[PDB]
C-alpha cells in the first residue's frame, strides 16, 4: 500500500485538497461487503 496526501478526488480541477498526516502507526479494520467489476472482450469464441 501507498499513502498520498494531496488528493483531487472526484477529479474536479481548480481545487485540490491536502490530507494532513496522522501521528504514528495508523490501523483500521474493515469488513468487505461489496465489489465492482468489468469484463474483457470478444477474444476467442466461447473460450474464457
Amino acid at each position, epitope marked *: 500500500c501507498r499513502i498520498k496526501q494531496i488528493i483531487n478526488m472526484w477529479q474536479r480541477i481548480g481545487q485540490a485538497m491536502y490530507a494532513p498526516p496522522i501521528q504514528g502507526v495508523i490501523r483500521c479494520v474493515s469488513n468487505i461487503t461489496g465489489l465492482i467489476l468489468t469484463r474483457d*472482450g470478444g477474444s476467442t469464441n466461447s473460450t474464457t
Partner: antibody
Amino acid sequence: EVQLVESGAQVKKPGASVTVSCTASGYKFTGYHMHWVRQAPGRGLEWMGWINPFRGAVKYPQNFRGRVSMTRDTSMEIFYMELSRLTSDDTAVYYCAREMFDSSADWSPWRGMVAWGQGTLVTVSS
Amino acid sequence: SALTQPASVSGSPGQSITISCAGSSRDVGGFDLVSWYQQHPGKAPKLIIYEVNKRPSGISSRFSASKSGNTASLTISGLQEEDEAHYYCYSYADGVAFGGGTKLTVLG
C-alpha cells in the same frame, strides 16, 4: 467545433517502441470516450482500444493487448497511445476517434465514432 | 473482419446500390448496433450510418441503411462522384467488429 489532432509520422527500427498522441479540444474533455484505430495500407479498420478520460478507464481488444499503452493528460487535454516490439506488421496509419454521446454523469455508448484523427504513419523497416 | 461485406460494388451514376453486412446473431441479428462509415482515399474515415439505420448531422438524405435478421444492409440513392470511396460496416459483438470494406465505382 471539436478537433482531434495526432502526432507526426515516424520512421523507426524494428523491435523498438513508438508513442502516438491525440489532442482533443472544443468540448468537455474528461467526459468523452476516445477510440484508437489503425488501418494498414489497403486493409480494413483495426480497433485498438479506448480510454475513458474519467479517471482514465481503459478497455483494449484481445489481439492488441500487451503492446498497447493508451493514456490521456486531462490537464493538457492530450490522449496518448504507444506500441512496442515494433514489427513490419505493425506499420499502419493510426487514428483516434470519439464516441457519439457522452456526458459527465450517465453514459452509454459503444457504436459511435464521429470525430476522427487525421492519422499517423508509423513505419518499421530494417 | 467478423462482418461480411462485398469486395467491390459498381453502379451507374444516379442509381441505387445496396451494400450487405452479414454475420451471426451475435452482432447483426441480436443487436441494433450496426453502423457504417465513409472513407475518402487518403483521408480519415467518416461516419455515415449507425444504430443499424441512423444519419449523423450533415449526412445527405440519399443515404440510409437497415438490418434484415442476421444481415444488415446499406443503401445510397442519388449517386454522385462525391460518393466514390470506401464504406465499412461496423457492429458490436462484445468488441468492435468491422467489415472488410467495399469500393464504389462507375458501372456500364
